[PDB]
């Protein structure tokens, strides 16, 4: 490595890593890859959405539209151009279509007219190289969603009929799209049906709609006990395995042996008796069948009348009629009280319909009520509900879960439902009602899949595609045929409108958090339970907001918001993947015969619930087996002890449970989870400061986050560095990585002082030097808050834990003045103000420096063209750009007539409406961008900005042509030395004139002339690129309708810390700065070094975040090692002393896995390493794999510091000594984005709301603090009647009272005269406009 040889973090983890941390943005990039990518058959994304609707026939069938292929054009602008211009970053969608015409005058007139032109179906916004979308110039992130998977889920309730406290089992079939279908039960044990949660029908209505009679329903849902009547005494063929524990209605009989007596219940020994005798027929008394229900339709075969139908309780006269009619063999259903219930019998008795047509009009009367139901209308509705692919789909994940839950075998199948599926769901629900089987776990991670950005945009594309497919089928039905192109009938409005509506304003298209790189990467790895198809925030219970045991390795349990969003927004764990179906999976190492191998299996949520999986904190040796016998494991939800050979899997790493941000906390295992949650939250709100500062106590996940966030500049191809700048890095590639048709020069253009979404600063500082060799995959430029490729959100602060005079009372923080002097937590806040020149109907506005009735002091900051200079330090109430507005003539006086006569300013009354900087805001001006529309000549200032951009682009294209002609002349040198041997005669002459040298005409001469004309056409495409760039920056902008030109002004403020600024560590220890104490007042030790920050010790033993204290002690040790290395470097000892001491500090831990050896390090690298270590040696500490207190004390003993962690501090002011030793060390503090510059607000009088005449709300529009209902109650409890009347009237919506109060206060007479608040008159007028006469009755 090369960026790692310059500063190596000491690792304290004792376990090896058999699987590295993957690419942290594989979920977003892979989902959009599967959406946008061209696949032949494994249907994904755009090709699947095209095949789902194409082809389409006519209203008759005389023409149809075939889809051939689609492609995507090149985007018109790169990502930085879209972010500058304020347009989305999209691509044109060009798709080849085929239009054929069926000659209906012919029997099969296939070929009449074949059209194949290129059609333009809207635009799709592309995803950049970091996983974000640029929509209208701003940067968004489409958060993944966690919804219920399609399929069937047999759930239940828990005591909803409290008249009995019974359970009421219910199924629910969830399609991907289409009408839901829910079977359920009642307290009277009847199967019901709701379609789309509508009114309850009996559940045999759907069966009779499926063309099933009562007989076939009974055969499907019951079994037959067969009865034969012989010489007027009844006999029953009895299978003995139908009688469990119940009493006998009669003394049972066999051929010659009595087994079970009357009044004697039948035992399992009696079951063994009746299977060991193997009897078949058993005679039965008359009253035993009085209670059975006939399952067969029976008619008197002599005459032809219905004697008894199916499902009717037979009687004595009915059995006499069945004996005398000739039907001497009856089939009744077998029922029971315990298991085989009479549910379907009772639903057939409740069931009022009788045939297919009556059930169909019952379904139509339920679905589209208040209409006359007809036969074909009810038939077409019932077909289109479930059994038609154009209005119902399971999309094969629902089919997988369906066959999985019905215990089937075949995975793939029909997307639509069918009769076997419906009767299988009813049979399984009846099995649940029996007792064989179990209900499903609703909050399982096998019932909840992940619907990512590519799937969601595919569905919105399909919605737009059917919305345009309907209209193009309508047009193809009635239009002409010979001249009908596909282009004028395909309309790009619905598809582009739907996909732009989704990408711009869905509930899952979120404005990306851009505080630090951890903010953006945690947003891009986020999982939302809300959105379209998911839950809602207000009506979600505690069961969805809990840590299910299947979250181990897939979803983080300690990273989530802490408000009303707590269980509903989750975070993906570090190693978590998805299936092809969308279920979360996490890797495990397969153990075989005790040997834990290095084979990695990604197990999904349901597969891991079978095996025994070892913990990652179980001990291994010699790459062998476990060191103990009673090993912990987890299986089937719970976690208990197991043997060392029974185990099936092991966790791949110790950080497998926690997310990205929760695995940056050192000593996380010593933290309470309520504080670790808040630390993982508050790391994402930390502003990037002026100079980045790596944590001395870290995790080693910092380099992974800093590289994978895309916020740095990583090297695409390794080599050596040719030229560094503040804004450019030029890398000469090695010839091995160089391709045989190029030069081998990469250019990196660093983005400098770009604004983030949270108005913070983004700039890339180059971390390499001149002539330094790099490799492929090292960091070239530190981003906003990274330091040498490590994540650096804050600074390392010398922290003392003691109470200091009540200045750290209740989570407060006392800060030295050296932290404010040295500018450690000083952040830059870039802020963009805009000024739009619009076309008023009274006259067009103009942006010119000529501003009326203002003083010439404010005109010094503007230029002669009306725009402020780059670099001018503006303040509040100043002017940035002078835009005046035509007020309007509206009068004809001789004064204005003489004015328009003498000057010609025909709108000589103008209203100055210039853009002014809002109050309380300051800072310089770092960037001015002026956009203009077509036709209007722009300005001198816009010409100057245009010339500067033109010169910059021309310099970039000139360097591009220089390196490309260098590579081409290297290629002609290579083919010249391949053809002949000419070395001195080619380089004794200049390289640009390498074309006039020649020889005899041969293959190499032909190659010389062909590369000559290739260099000529290279010059041709070079000047074509120049002309394209020139016309692109000279063309007028595609601005909104109604504007003429837009001026954007960028400010930049530096915000030092102050009392009231919020500050936090990493363990959920937030605090507000209360005082900024001088260095002569801070406490110190006997070397005289004062402490940078004094924290409160009483915040520790209630919140139980002991990682605070352990990070303090390890930071004290690390800074002690850095102090000793700095002492040796300042004394300039040797290289051998430095090598010995740094080696002793490196190989220090107990049995740690890091083996660093400076024997291979050359002396310049050891001096470079000691220079980077002179401010403190950084120390890694993985989560749940930490450094012990023994290793902390060992490092403290190396650093010649106290072993117990505590030194003796002296008072800063009195010079005396604190009576106890005080814990002093180096915590890592962050500066959160809740600054008192943004919270502080005050208002005496301002603007008012229009309807209610009450003061506004908000610091942005200078609002008033809402004196709400609870404060009205508090004043009522005090008794302050005059203060309450003052609040309700004269500080509020009472107009005469508030004007008189202002002028009475200025008159020195503090007295109010109150009246009626105007919101009461608003209320009176609204109750009157409801047709209700309300009036204040006078006395």
């Amino acid at each position: 490595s090369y960026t790692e040889k310059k500063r190596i973090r000491k690792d304290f983890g004792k376990r090896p890593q058999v699987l590295d941390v993957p690419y942290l943005l594989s979920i977003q990039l892979d989902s959009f890859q599967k959406f946008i990518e061209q696949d032949p058959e494994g249907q994904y994304g755009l090709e699947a959405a095209f095949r789902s609707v194409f082809p389409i026939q006519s209203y008759s069938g005389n023409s149809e539209l075939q889809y051939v292929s689609y492609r995507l054009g090149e985007p018109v602008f790169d990502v930085q151009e879209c972010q500058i211009r304020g347009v989305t970053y999209s691509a044109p969608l060009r798709v080849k279509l085929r239009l054929v015409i069926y000659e209906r005058e012919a029997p099969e007139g296939t070929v009449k007219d074949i059209k194949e032109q290129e059609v333009y179906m809207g635009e799709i916004p592309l995803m950049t190289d970091n996983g974000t979308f640029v929509i209208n110039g701003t940067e968004r992130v489409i958060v993944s969603q966690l919804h219920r998977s399609p399929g069937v889920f047999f759930d239940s309730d828990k005591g909803k009929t409290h008249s009995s406290g019974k359970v009421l089992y219910n199924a629910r079939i969830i399609p991907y799209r289409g009408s839901w279908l829910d079977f359920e039960f009642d307290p009277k044990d009847n199967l019901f049906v709701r379609i789309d949660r509508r009114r309850k029908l009996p559940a045999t209505i759907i069966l009779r709609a499926l063309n099933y009679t009562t007989e076939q329903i009974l055969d499907l849902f019951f079994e037959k006990v067969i009865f034969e009547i012989r010489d007027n005494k009844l006999q029953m063929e009895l299978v003995p395995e139908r009688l469990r524990g119940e009493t006998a209605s009669f003394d049972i009989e066999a051929n010659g042996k009595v087994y079970v007596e009357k009044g004697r219940r039948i035992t399992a020994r009696h079951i063994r008796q009746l299977e060991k005798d193997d009897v078949k027929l058993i005679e039965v008394p008359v009253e035993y069948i009085a209670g059975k229900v006939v399952a067969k339709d029976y008619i008197d075969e002599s005459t032809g009348e219905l004697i008894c139908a199916a499902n009717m309780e037979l009687s004595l006269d009915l059995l006499a009629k069945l004996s005398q009619s000739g039907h001497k063999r009856i089939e009744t259903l077998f029922t029971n009280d315990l298991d085989h219930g009479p549910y379907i019998s009772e639903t057939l008795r409740v069931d009022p319909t009788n045939d297919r047509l009556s059930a169909l009009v019952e379904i139509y009367r339920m679905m589209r009520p208040g209409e006359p139901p007809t036969r074909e209308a009810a038939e077409s509705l019932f077909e289109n509900l479930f059994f038609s692919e154009d209005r119902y789909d399971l999309s094969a994940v629902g089919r997988m879960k369906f066959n999985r839950s019905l215990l089937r075998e075949e995975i793939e199948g029909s997307g639509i439902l069918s009769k076997d599926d419906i009767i299988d769901v009813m049979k399984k629900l009846i099995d649940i009602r029996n007792g064989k089987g179990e209900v499903d776990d609703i909050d399982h991670l096998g019932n909840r899949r992940i619907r990512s950005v590519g799937e969601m945009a595919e569905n919105q594309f399909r919605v737009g595609l059917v919305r345009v497919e309907r209209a193009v089928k309508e047009r193809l039905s009635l239009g002409d045929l010979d001249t009908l192109m596909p282009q004028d009938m395909i309309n790009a409005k619905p598809i582009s409108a739907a996909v732009k509506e989704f990408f711009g304003s869905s509930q899952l298209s979120q404005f990306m958090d851009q505080n630090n790189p951890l903010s953006e990467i945690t947003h891009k790895r986020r999982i939302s339970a809300l959105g379209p198809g998911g839950l809602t925030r207000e009506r979600a219970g505690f069961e969805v907001r809990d840590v299910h045991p299947t979250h181990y390795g897939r979803v983080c349990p300690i990273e989530t918001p802490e408000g009303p969003n707590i269980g509903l927004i989750n975070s993906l764990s570090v190693y978590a993947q998805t299936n092809e179906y969308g279920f979360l999976e996490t890797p495990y190492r397969k153990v075989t015969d005790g040997v834990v191998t290095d084979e990695i299996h990604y197990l999904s949520a349901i597969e891991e619930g079978n095996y025994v999986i070892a913990q990652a904190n179980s001990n291994l040796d010699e790459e062998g087996h476990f060191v103990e016998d009673l090993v912990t494991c987890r299986s089937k939800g719970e976690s208990s002890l197991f043997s060392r050979d029974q185990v099936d899997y092991m966790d791949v790493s110790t950080q497998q449970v926690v997310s990205v941000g929760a695995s940056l906390i050192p000593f996380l295992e010593h933290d309470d989870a309520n504080r670790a949650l808040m630390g993982a939250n508050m790391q994402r709100q930390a502003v990037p400061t002026l100079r980045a500062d790596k944590p001395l106590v870290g995790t080693g996940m910092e380099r992974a986050v800093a590289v994978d966030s895309g916020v740095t500049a990583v090297a695409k191809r390794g080599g050596v560095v040719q030229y560094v700048d503040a804004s450019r890095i030029v890398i000469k590639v090695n010839e091995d990585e160089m391709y045989p048709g190029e030069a081998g020069i990469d250019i990196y253009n660093l983005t400098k002082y770009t604004r983030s979404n949270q108005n913070t600063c983004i700039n890339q500082m180059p971390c390499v030097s001149l002539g330094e060799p790099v490799e492929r995959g090292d960091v070239l430029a530190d981003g906003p808050s990274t330091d040498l490729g490590e994540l650096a959100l804050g600074q390392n602060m010398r922290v003392a834990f003691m109470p200091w005079n009540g200045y750290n009372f209740e989570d407060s923080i006392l800060v030295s003045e050296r932290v404010v002097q040295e500018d450690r937590f000083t952040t830059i806040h870039i802020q963009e103000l805009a000024c739009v020149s619009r076309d008023t109907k009274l006259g067009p506005e103009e942006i010119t420096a000529d501003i009326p009735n203002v003083g010439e002091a404010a005109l010094s900051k503007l230029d002669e063209s009306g725009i402020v200079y780059i670099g001018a330090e503006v303040t509040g109430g100043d002017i940035l750009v002078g835009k005046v507005t035509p007020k309007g003539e509206t009068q004809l006086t001789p004064e204005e007539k003489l004015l328009r006569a003498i000057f010609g300013e025909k709108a000589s009354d103008v209203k100055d409406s210039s853009l002014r900087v809002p109050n309380g805001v300051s800072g310089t001006v770092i960037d001015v961008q002026v956009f203009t529309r077509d036709g209007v000549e722009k300005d001198k200032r816009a010409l100057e900005i245009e010339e500067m951009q033109l010169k910059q682009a021309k310099k970039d294209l000139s360097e591009e042509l220089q390196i490309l002609e260098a590579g081409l002349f290297s290629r002609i040198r290579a083919v010249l030395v391949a053809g002949g041997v000419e070395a001195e005669k080619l380089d004794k002459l200049p390289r640009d004139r390498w074309l006039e040298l020649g020889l005899t005409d041969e293959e190499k001469q032909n190659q010389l002339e062909q590369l000559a004309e290739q260099y000529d056409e290279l010059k041709h495409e070079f000047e074509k690129k120049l002309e394209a760039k020139r016309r692109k920056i000279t063309q007028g902008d595609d601005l909104a309708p109604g504007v003429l030109k837009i001026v954007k002004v960028y400010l930049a403020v530096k915000r030092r810390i102050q009392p009231g600024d919020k500050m936090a560590g990493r363990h959920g220890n937030k605090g507000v700065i209360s005082k900024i104490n001088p260095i002569e007042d801070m406490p110190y030790d006997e070397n005289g070094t004062p402490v940078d920050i004094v924290l409160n010790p009483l915040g520790v033993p209630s919140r139980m975040n002991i990682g605070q204290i352990l990070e303090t002690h390890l930071g004290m040790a690390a800074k002690g090692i850095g102090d000793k290395i700095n002492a040796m470097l300042k004394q300039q000892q040797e290289v051998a002393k430095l090598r010995e001491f740094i080696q002793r500090a490196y190989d220090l831990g107990a049995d740690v896995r890091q083996k660093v050896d400076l024997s291979t390090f050359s002396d310049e690298e050891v001096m470079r390493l000691a220079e980077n270590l002179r401010k403190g040696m950084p120390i890694a500490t993985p989560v749940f794999d930490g450094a012990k207190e023994a290793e902390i004390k060992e490092l403290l003993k190396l650093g010649d510091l106290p072993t117990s962690g505590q030194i003796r501090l002296y008072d800063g002011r009195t010079g005396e000594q604190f009576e106890r030793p005080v814990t002093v060390g180096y915590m890592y503090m962050l500066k959160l984005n809740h600054l008192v510059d943004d919270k502080m607000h005050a208002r005496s009088t301002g603007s008012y709301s229009l309807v209610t005449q009450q003061p506004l709300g908000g610091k942005a529009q200078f609002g008033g603090q809402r004196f709400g209902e609870m404060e009205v109650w508090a004043l009522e409890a005090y008794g302050a009647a005059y203060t309450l009347q003052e609040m309700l009237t004269v500080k509020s919506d009472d107009v005469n009272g508030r004007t008189k109060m202002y002028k009475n206060i200025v008159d020195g007479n503090h007295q109010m005269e109150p009246g009626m608040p105007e919101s009461f008159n608003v209320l009176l007028k609204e109750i009157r406009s409801l047709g209700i006469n309300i009036e204040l009755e006078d006395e």
Partner: peptide
């Protein structure tokens, strides 16, 4: 059926669907 609806266009469609179409 008269009664169980509240959609006005559904009631209007039900009303207009009774008079027969001319030849």
């Amino acid at each position: 059926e008269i009664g169980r609806t509240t959609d006005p266009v559904r009631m209007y469609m039900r009303e207009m669907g009774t008079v027969e179409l001319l030849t």
